[PDB]
Design a protein around this ligand. Sequence first.
Ligand SMILES: NS(=O)(=O)c1ccc(C(=O)N2CCCN(Cc3ccccc3)CC2)cc1
Ligand SMILES: [Zn+2]
Length: 257
Amino acid sequence: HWGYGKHNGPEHWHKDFPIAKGERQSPVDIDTHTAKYDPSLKPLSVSYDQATSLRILNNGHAFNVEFDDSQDKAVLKGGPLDGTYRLIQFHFHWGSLDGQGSEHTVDKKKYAAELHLVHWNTKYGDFGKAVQQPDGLAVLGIFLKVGSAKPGLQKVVDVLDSIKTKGKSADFTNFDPRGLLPESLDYWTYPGSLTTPPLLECVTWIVLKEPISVSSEQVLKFRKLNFNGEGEPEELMVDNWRPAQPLKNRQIKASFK
Ligand SMILES: NS(=O)(=O)c1ccc(C(=O)N2CCCN(Cc3ccccc3)CC2)cc1
Ligand SMILES: [Zn+2]
């Protein structure tokens, strides 16, 4: 099965997922000097006041915080998007060391981690249909640097002990994803893909310019999670990031000067 090890990591994925070498793969390096300011891009509309978190799951590659996406409760609109995208889950990618862990890079700079808030286009009715469309998903990406603690992350950090191993889940109600956002919603946007198999080319990527700060202790707790199932040999869940992929025939647009 695919993963992040020497034998099943990102350089292997193309053998089961040939779209790995496709024309719109993610993540990418964001060259801040070559990104073009698009004054036609709208402010992002992040409407998370009615968000309903349900559960947190260790899926063997990350943990997902899942949301009730059966009504317009937590939606992303505006920016480069046409129509209404519902929040279904967020998860993170992180490193074994503070100098690596993000999937996107900014002028080749790696951040300690990256948050992905995953949303699907309501005109396609469900997430399974949306991932089959070139405009099916909108993923809001937010960089994490190590510094001050992020208070709004701590409820996530404190439950991870209960989902240490693959297939473990825990109730995770009344979590407010607004506490994970930076002050600025300035962004870069480009068309891309899922960053894990099946690597579908269904994502409008929206990557915030402003990172959030998390403490060394918060990201240390991410690194105590396991890729393996209970009773299987312990392999720390670290370095669950795909490296930057070729930009090919794509332009990254900036919402800001
Ligand atoms: N890193 S990320 O780019 O933000 C990101 C990567 C993967 C997902 C994701 O949802 N998965 C797990 C589920 C399977 N689906 C596809 C599917 C194929 C057949 C029936 C149903 C769904 C896509 C991969 C989401 C976001
Ligand atoms: Zn992701």
